[PDB]
Coordinates of C-alpha atoms and ligand atoms in Angstrom, one line a residue:
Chain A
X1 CA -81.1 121.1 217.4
X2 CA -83.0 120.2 220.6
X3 CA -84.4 116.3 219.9
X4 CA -85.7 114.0 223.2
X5 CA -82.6 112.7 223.7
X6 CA -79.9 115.3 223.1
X7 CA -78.7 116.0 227.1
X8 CA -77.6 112.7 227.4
X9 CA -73.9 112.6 227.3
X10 CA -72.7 108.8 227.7
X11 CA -74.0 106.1 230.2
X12 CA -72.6 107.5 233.5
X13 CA -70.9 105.2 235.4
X14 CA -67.5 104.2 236.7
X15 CA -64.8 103.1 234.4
X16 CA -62.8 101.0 237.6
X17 CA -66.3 99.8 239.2
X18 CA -69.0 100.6 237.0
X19 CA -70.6 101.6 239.9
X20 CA -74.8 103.7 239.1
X21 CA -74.1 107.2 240.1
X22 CA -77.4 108.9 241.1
X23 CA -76.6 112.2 239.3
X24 CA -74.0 112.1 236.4
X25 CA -74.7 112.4 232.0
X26 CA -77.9 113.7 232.4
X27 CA -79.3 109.8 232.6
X28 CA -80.3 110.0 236.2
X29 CA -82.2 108.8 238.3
X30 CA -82.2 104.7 238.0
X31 CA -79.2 102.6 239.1
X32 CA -80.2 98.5 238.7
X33 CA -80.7 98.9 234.8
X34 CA -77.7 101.4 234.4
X35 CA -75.5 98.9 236.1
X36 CA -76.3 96.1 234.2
X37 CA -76.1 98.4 230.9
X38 CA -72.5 99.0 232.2
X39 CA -71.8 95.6 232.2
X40 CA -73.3 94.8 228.7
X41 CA -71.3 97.6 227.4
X42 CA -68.3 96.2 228.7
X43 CA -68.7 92.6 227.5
X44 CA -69.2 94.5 223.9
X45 CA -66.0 96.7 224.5
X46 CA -64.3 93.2 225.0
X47 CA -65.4 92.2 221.9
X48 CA -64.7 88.3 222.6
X49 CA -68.2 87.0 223.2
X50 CA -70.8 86.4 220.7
X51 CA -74.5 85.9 220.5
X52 CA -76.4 87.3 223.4
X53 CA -79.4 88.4 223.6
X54 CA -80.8 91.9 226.1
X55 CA -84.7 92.5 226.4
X56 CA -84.6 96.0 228.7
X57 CA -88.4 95.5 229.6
X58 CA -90.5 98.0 231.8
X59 CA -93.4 100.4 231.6
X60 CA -93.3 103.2 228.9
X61 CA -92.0 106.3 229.1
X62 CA -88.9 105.0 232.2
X63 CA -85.8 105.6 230.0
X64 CA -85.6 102.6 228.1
X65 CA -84.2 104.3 224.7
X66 CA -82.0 106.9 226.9
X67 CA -80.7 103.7 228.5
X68 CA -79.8 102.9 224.4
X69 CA -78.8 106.0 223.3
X70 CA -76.3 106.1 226.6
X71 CA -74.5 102.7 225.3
X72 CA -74.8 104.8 222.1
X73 CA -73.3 107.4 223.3
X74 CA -70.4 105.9 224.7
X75 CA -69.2 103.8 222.0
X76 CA -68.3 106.5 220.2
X77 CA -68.0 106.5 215.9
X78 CA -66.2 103.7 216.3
X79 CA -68.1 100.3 216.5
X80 CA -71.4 100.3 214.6
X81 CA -74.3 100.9 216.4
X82 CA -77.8 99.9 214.2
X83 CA -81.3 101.6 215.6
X84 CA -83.1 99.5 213.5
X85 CA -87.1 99.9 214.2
X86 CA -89.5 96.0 214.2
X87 CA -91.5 97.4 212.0
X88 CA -88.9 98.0 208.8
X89 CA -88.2 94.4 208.3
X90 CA -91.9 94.2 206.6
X91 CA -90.8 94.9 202.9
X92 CA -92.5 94.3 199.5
X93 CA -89.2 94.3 198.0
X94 CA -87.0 91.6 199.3
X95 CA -88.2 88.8 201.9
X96 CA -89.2 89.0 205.7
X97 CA -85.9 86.7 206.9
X98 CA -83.0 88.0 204.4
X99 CA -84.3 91.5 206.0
X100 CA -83.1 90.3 209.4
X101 CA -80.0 88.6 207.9
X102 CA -79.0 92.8 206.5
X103 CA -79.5 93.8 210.0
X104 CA -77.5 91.3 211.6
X105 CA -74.7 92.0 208.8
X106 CA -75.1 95.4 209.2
X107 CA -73.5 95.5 212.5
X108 CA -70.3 93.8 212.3
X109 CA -67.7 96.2 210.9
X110 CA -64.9 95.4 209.2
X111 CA -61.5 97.7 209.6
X112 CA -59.1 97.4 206.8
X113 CA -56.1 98.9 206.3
X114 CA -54.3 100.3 202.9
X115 CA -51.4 102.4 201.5
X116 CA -52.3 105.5 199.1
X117 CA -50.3 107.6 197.9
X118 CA -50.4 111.6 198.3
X119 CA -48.5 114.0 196.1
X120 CA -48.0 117.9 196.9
X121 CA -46.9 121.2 195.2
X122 CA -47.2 123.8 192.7
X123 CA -48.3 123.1 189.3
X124 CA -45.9 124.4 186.8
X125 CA -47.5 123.7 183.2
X126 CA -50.5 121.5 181.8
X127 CA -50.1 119.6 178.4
X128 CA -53.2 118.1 177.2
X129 CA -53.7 116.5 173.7
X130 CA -57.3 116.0 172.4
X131 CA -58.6 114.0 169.5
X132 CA -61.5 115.3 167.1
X133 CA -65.1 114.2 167.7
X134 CA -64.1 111.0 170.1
X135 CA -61.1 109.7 170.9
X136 CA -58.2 109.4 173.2
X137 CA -56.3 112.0 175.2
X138 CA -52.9 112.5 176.1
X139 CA -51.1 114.5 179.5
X140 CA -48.4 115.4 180.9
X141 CA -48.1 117.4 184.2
X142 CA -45.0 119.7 185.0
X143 CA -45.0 119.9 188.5
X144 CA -42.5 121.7 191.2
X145 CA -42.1 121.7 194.9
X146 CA -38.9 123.7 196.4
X147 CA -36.5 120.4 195.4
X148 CA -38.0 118.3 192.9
X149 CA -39.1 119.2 189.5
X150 CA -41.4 116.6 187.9
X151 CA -43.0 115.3 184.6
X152 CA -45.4 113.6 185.2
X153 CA -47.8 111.6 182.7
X154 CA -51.4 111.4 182.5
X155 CA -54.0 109.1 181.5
X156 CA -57.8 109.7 180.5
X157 CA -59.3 109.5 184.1
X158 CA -56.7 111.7 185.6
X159 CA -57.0 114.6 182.4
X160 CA -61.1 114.3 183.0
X161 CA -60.8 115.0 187.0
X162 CA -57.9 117.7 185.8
X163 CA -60.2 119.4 183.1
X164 CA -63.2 119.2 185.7
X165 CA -61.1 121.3 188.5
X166 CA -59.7 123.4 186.0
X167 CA -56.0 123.1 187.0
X168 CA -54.4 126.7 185.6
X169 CA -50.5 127.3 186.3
X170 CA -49.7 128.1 189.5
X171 CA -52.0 125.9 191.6
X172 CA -51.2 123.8 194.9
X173 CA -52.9 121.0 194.2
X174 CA -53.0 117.2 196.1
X175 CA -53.8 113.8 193.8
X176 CA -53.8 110.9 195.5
X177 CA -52.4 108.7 192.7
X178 CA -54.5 105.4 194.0
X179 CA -57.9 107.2 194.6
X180 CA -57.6 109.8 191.8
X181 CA -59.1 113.1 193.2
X182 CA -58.1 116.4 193.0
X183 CA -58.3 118.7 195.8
X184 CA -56.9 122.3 194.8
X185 CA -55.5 124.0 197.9
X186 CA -54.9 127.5 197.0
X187 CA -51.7 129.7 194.2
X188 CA -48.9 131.1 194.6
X189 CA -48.9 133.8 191.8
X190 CA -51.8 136.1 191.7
X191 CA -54.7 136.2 188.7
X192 CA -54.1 137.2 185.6
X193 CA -55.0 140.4 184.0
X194 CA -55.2 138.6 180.4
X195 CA -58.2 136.6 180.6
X196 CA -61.6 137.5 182.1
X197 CA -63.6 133.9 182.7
X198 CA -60.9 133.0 185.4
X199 CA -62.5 132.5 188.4
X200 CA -62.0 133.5 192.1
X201 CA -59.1 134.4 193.8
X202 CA -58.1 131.4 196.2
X203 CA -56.1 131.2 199.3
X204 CA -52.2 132.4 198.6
X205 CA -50.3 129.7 200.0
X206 CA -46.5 129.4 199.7
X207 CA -44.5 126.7 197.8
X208 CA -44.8 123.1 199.5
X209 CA -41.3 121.8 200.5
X210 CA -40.3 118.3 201.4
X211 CA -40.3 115.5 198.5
X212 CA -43.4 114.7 195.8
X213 CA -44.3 110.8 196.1
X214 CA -45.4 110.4 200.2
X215 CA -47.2 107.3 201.4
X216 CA -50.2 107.5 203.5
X217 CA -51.9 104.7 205.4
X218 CA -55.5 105.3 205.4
X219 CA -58.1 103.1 207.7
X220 CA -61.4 102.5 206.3
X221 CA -64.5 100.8 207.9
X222 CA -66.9 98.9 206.3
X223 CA -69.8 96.6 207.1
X224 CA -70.3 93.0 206.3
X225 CA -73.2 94.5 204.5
X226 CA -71.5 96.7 201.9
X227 CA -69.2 93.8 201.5
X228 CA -72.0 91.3 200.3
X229 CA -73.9 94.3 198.5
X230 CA -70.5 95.1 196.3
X231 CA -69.3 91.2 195.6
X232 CA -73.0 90.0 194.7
X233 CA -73.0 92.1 191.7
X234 CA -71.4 92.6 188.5
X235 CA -71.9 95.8 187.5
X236 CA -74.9 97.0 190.0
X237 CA -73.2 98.6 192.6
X238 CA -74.8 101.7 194.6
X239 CA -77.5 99.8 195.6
X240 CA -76.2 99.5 198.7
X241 CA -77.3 103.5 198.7
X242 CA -80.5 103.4 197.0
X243 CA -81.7 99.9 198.9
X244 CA -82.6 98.2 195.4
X245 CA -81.0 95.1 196.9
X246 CA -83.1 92.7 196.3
X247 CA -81.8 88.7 197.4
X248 CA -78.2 87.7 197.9
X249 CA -77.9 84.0 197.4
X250 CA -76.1 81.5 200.5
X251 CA -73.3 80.9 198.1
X252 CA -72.3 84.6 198.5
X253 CA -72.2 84.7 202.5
X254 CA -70.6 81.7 202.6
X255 CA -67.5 82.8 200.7
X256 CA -67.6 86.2 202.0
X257 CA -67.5 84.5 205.6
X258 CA -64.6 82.6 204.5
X259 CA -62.3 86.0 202.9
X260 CA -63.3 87.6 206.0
X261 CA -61.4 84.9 208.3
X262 CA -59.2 85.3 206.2
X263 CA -58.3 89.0 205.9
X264 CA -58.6 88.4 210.0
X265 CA -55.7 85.6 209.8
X266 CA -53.4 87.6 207.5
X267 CA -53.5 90.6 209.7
X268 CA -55.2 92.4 206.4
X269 CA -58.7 93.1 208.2
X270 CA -59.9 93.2 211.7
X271 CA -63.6 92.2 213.0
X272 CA -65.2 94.7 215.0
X273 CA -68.5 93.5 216.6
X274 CA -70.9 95.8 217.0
X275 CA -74.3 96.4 218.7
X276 CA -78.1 95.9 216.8
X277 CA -80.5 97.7 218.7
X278 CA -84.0 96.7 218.0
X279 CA -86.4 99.4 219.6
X280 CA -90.0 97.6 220.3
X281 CA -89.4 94.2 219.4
X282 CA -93.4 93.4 220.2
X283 CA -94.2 93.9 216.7
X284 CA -92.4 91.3 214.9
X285 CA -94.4 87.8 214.4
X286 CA -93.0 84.6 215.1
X287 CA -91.6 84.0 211.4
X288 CA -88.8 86.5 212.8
X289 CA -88.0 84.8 215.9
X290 CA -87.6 81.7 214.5
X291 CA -84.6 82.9 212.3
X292 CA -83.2 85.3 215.1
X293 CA -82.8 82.8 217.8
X294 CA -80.7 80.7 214.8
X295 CA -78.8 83.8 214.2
X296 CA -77.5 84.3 216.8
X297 CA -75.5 81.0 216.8
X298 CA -72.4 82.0 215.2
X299 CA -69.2 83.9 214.9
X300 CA -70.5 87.0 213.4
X301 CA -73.5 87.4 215.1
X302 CA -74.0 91.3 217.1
X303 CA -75.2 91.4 220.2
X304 CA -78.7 92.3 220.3
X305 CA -80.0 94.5 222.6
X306 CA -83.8 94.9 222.6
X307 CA -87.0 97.0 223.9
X308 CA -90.2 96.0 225.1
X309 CA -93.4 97.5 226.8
X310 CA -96.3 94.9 226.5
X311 CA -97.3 92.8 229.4
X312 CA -99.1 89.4 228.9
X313 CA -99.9 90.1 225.0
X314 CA -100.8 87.4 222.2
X315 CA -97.4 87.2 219.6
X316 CA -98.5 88.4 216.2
X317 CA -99.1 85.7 213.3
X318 CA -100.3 83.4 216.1
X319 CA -103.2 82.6 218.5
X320 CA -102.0 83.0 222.1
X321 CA -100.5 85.0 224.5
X322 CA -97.1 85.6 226.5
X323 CA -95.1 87.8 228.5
X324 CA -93.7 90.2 226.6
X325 CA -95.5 89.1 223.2
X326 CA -92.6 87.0 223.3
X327 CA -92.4 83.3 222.7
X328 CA -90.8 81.0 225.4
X329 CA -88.6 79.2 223.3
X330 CA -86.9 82.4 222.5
X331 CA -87.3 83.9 225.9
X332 CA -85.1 81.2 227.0
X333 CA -82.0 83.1 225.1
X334 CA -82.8 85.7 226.4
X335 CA -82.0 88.0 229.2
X336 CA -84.4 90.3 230.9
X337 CA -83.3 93.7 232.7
X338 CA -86.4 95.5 234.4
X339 CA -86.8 98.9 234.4
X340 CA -89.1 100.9 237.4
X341 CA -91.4 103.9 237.3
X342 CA -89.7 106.9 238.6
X343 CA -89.7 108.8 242.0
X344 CA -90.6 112.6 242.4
X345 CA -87.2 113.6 243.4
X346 CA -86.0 111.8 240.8
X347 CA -88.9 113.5 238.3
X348 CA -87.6 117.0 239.3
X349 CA -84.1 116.5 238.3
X350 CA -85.0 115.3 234.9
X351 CA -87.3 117.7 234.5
X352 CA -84.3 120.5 235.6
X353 CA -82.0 118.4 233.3
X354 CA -84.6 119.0 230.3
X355 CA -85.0 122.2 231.3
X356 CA -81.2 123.3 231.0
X357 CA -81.2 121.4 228.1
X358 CA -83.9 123.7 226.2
X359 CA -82.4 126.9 227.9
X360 CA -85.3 127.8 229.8
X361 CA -85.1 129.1 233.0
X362 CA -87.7 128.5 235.9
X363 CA -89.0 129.6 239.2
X364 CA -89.0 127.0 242.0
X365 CA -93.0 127.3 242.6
X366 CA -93.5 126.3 238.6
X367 CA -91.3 123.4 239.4
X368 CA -93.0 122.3 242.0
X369 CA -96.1 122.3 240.3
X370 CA -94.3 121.3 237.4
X371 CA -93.4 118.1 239.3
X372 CA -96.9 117.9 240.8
X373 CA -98.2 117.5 237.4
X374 CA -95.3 114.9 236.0
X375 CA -96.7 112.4 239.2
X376 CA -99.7 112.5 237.6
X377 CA -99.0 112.8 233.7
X378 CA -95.2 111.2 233.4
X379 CA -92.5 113.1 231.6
X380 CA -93.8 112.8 228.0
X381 CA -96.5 115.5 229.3
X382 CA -94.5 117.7 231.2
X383 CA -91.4 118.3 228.7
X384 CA -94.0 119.1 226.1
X385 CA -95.2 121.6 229.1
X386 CA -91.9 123.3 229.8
X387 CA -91.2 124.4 226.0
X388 CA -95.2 125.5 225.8
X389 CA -94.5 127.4 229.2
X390 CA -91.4 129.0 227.7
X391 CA -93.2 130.2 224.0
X392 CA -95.9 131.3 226.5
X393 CA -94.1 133.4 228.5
X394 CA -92.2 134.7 225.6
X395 CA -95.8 135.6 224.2
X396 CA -96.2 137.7 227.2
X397 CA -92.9 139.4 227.5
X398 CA -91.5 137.8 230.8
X399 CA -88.3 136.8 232.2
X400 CA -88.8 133.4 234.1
X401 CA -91.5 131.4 233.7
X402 CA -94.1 131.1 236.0
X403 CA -97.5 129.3 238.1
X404 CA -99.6 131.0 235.6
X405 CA -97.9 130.0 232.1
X406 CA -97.4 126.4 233.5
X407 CA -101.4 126.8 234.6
X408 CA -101.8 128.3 230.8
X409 CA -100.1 125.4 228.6
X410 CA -102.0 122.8 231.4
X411 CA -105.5 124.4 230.5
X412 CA -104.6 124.8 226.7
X413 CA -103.2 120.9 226.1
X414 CA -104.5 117.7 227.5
X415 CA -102.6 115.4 229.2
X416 CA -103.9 111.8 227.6
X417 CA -105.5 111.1 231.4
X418 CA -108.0 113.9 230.4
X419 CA -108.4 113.0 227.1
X420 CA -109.7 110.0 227.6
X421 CA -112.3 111.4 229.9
X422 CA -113.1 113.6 226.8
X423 CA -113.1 110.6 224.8
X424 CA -116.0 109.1 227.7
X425 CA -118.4 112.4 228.1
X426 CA -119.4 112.8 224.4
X427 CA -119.3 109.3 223.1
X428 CA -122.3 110.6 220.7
X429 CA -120.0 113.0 219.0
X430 CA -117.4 110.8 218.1
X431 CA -117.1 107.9 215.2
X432 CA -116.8 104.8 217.3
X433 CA -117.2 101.2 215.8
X434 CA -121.0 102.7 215.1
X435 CA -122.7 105.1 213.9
X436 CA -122.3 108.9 215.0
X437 CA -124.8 111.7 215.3
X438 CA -124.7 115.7 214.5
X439 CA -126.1 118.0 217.3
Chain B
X1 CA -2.6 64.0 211.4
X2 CA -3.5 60.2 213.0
X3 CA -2.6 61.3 216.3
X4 CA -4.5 64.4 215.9
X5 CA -7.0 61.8 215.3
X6 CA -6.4 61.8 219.3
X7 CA -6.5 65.7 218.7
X8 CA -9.8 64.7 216.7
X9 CA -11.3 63.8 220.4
X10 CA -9.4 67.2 221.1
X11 CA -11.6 68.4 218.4
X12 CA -14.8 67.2 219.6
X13 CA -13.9 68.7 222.8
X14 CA -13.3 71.9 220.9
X15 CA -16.9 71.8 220.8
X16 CA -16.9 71.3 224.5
X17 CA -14.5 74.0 225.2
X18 CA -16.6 76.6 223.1
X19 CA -18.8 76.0 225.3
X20 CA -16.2 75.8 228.1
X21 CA -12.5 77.5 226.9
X22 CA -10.5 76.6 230.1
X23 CA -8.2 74.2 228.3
X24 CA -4.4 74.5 227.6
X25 CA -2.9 71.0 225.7
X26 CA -2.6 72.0 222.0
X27 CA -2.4 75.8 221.9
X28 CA 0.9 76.5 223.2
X29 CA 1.9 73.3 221.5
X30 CA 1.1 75.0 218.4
X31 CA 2.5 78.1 219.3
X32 CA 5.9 75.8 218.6
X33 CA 4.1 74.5 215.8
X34 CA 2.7 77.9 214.2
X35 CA 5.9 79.8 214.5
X36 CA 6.8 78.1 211.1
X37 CA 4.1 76.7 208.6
X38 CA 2.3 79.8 209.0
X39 CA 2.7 83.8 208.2
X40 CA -0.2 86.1 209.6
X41 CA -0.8 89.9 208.3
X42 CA -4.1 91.4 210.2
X43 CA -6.9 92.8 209.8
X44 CA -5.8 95.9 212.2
X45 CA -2.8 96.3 209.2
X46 CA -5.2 96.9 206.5
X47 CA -8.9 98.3 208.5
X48 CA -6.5 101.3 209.4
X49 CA -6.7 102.5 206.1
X50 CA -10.4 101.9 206.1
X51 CA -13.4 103.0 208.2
X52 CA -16.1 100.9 210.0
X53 CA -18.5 97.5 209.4
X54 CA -21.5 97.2 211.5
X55 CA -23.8 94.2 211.8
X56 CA -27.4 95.2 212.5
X57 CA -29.2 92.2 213.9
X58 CA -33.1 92.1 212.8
X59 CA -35.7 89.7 213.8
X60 CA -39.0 88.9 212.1
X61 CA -41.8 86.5 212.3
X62 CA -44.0 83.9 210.8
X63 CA -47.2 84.9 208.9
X64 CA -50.4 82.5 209.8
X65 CA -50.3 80.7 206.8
X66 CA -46.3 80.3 206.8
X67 CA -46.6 79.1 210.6
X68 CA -49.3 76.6 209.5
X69 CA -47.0 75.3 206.5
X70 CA -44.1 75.1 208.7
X71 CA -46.2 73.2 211.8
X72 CA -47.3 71.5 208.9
X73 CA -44.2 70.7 208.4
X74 CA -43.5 69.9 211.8
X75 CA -46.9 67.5 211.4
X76 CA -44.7 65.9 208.4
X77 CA -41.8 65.3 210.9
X78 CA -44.6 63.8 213.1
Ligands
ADP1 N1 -83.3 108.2 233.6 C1 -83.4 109.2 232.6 N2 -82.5 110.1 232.4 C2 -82.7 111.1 231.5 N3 -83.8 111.2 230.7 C3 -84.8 110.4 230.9 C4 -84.7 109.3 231.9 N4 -85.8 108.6 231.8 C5 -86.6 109.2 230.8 N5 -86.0 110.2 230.3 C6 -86.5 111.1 229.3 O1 -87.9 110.7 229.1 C7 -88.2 110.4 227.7 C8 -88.8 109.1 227.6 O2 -87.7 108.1 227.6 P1 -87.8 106.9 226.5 O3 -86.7 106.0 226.7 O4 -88.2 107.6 225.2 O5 -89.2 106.2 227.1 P2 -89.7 104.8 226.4 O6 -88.6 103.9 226.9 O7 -91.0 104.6 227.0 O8 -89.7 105.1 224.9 C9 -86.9 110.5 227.0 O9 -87.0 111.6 226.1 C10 -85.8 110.9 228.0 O10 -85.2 112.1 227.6

């Protein structure tokens, strides 16, 4: 669907001199903070350097997460990329620090490599042997392409997969003999006219040629997370799923550290560093920030980009105040890229960006006044306006919309600027920190 | 054979000349000795009969941990 950040398309700039373009993947309309996105985005794409640390501070509602979601965006499903919230790390379950420790570790894949092994072709007879009330079975698999004519043996895991597909005669089936699944592809002969709880009538695809045993090099991609979720266990594994994780001992990292270098040295694995996004870092207290600013301090540490709104507020779990809500031992690592409040001409192209993006077509006097009511309300105000305006004029049967739905949906919803004036006239109707009255 | 211990300098020289083969002392000399003492059939006799052999020259590598052994090796030699 439509979500608040779904016309942006990438970061926008140049890929020889990362220069801001004022118009390009619908993030437009700023150029300092675009830049220097472009040039944290490369210094991730190089991969080499480690531990940084990006606050993108600014007033609300000036692009901060489309600024993320553009880095996002242009990674690609490649590298990880965590949108972890400040406010998450607060479980009951497991501690405040070993929270930040999984989201450090969840961003730093890990890209192995391995050899399965694929077969292909039609299935000529099944041979299973059961036992009576418990016990041991026995296969074996007659199996044909156009040159080779196979029989194959079987084993319990591979008659319980074969037994839940129901493998008749005559199927094109795939096993990959290191994973064990079967994936049935489609017959050759037609259904029988001897049995009636058969089935449906698949896809009628020919005899596979070329050989039986082929090789496949797979490349899976897994975080240092699932690595330390499956080798702290014995038997617990898909907790990693079901986030019933609760402590993983030093002993464990520091091994799994260790194999990792490893598996890098032999050419076995490779180390992809990735990017932990921390929207509204103003929330955590200063029992976080004294284990990220150690964090980040090693070879398999992300680089941390980070949000911010507050101006001069006091850091939580303390007694004082800062910029940022941010201590200055921390804001020394740190490094700040400000963000500015928009222009009009700059408010009505994101406004006709979000307005191609929602398919809704407009006349030039609603924009304008469209416009004149985004100076005065930001965009958070006037996005919700142009979907209203469109249901509106759908209500009413027109074509475009117009002055008089946009003057509809701004006499229908408040803007927060006249909300808090309705807040300030009846202060006698409303539950303050005192006692209220009825009529 | 004592003075082809003087040939022996000749043969420390045959060293010399494969690196550098512009030489002419021994070779004619034995072409007078190899015309007896010696009865050679070729290869070009016999191959006729048979078909092709091919040397395929393929180079490899050292792994990270055979590198280290063998610098630690070289560390030994140090
Ligand atoms: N430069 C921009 N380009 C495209 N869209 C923008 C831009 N700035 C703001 N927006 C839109 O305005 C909305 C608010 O941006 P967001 O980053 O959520 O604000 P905040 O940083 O205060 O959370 C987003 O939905 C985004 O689509």
């Amino acid at each position: 669907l439509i979500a608040a950040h779904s016309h942006i398309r990438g970061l926008g700039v140049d890929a020889d001199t990362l220069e801001p373009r004022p118009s390009s993947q619908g993030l437009v309309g700023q150029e300092k903070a675009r830049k220097a996105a472009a040039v944290v985005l490369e210094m991730i794409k190089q991969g080499k350097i480690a531990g940084r640390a990006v606050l993108i501070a600014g007033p609300p509602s000036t692009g901060k997460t489309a600024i993320a979601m553009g880095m996002a965006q242009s990674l690609g499903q490649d590298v990880p990329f965590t949108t972890l919230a400040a406010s998450e790390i607060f479980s009951l379950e497991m501690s405040k620090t070993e929270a930040l420790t999984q989201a450090f570790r969840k961003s730093i894949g890990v890209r192995i490599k391995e050899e399965s092994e694929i077969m292909e072709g039609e299935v000529v007879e099944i041979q299973i042997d059961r036992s009576v009330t418990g016990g041991a079975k026995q296969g074996k698999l007659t199996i044909k392409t156009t040159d080779m004519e196979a029989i194959y043996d079987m084993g319990s895991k591979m008659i319980d997969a074969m037994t839940k597909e129901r493998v008749m005669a005559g199927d094109i089936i795939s096993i990959d003999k290191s994973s064990g699944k079967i994936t049935k592809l489609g017959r050759s002969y037609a259904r029988s006219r001897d049995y009636d709880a058969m089935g449906v009538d698949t896809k009628f695809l020919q005899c596979p040629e070329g050989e039986l045993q082929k090789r496949k090099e797979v490349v899976h991609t897994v975080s240092l997370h699932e690595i330390d979720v499956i080798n702290s266990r014995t038997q617990g594994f898909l907790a990693l799923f079901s986030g019933d994780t609760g402590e993983i001992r030093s002993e464990i990292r520091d091994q799994i550290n260790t194999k990792v270098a490893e598996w890098k040295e032999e050419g076995k694995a490779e180390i992809v560093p990735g990017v932990l996004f921390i929207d509204e870092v103003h929330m955590l207290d200063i029992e976080c920030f004294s284990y990220i600013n150690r964090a980040l301090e090693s070879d398999l540490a992300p680089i941390v980009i980070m949000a911010s709104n507050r101006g001069v507020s006091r850091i939580r779990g303390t007694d004082y105040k800062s910029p940022h809500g941010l201590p200055l031992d921390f804001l020394d690592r740190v490094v700040i890229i400000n963000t500015h409040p928009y222009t009009p001409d700059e408010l009505r192209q994101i406004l006709s960006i979000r307005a191609q993006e929602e398919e809704v077509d407009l006349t030039p006097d609603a924009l304008a006044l469209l416009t004149k009511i985004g100076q005065e309300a930001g965009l958070r105000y006037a996005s919700n306006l142009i979907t209203t305006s469109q249901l509106i004029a759908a209500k009413r049967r027109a074509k475009q919309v117009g002055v008089e739905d946009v003057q509809r949906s701004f006499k229908l919803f408040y803007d927060p600027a006249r909300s808090v004036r309705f807040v300030q006239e009846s202060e006698k109707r409303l539950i303050g920190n005192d006692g209220v009255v009825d009529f | 054979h004592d003075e082809f211990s003087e040939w022996f300098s000749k043969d420390i020289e045959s060293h010399a000349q494969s690196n550098t083969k512009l030489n002419e002392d021994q070779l004619k000399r034995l072409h007078m000795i190899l015309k007896p003492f010696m009865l050679r059939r070729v290869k070009k006799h016999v191959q006729k009969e048979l078909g092709d052999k091919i040397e395929i020259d393929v180079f490899c590598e050292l792994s990270y941990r055979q590198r280290a052994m063998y610098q630690s090796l070289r560390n030994q030699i140090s």
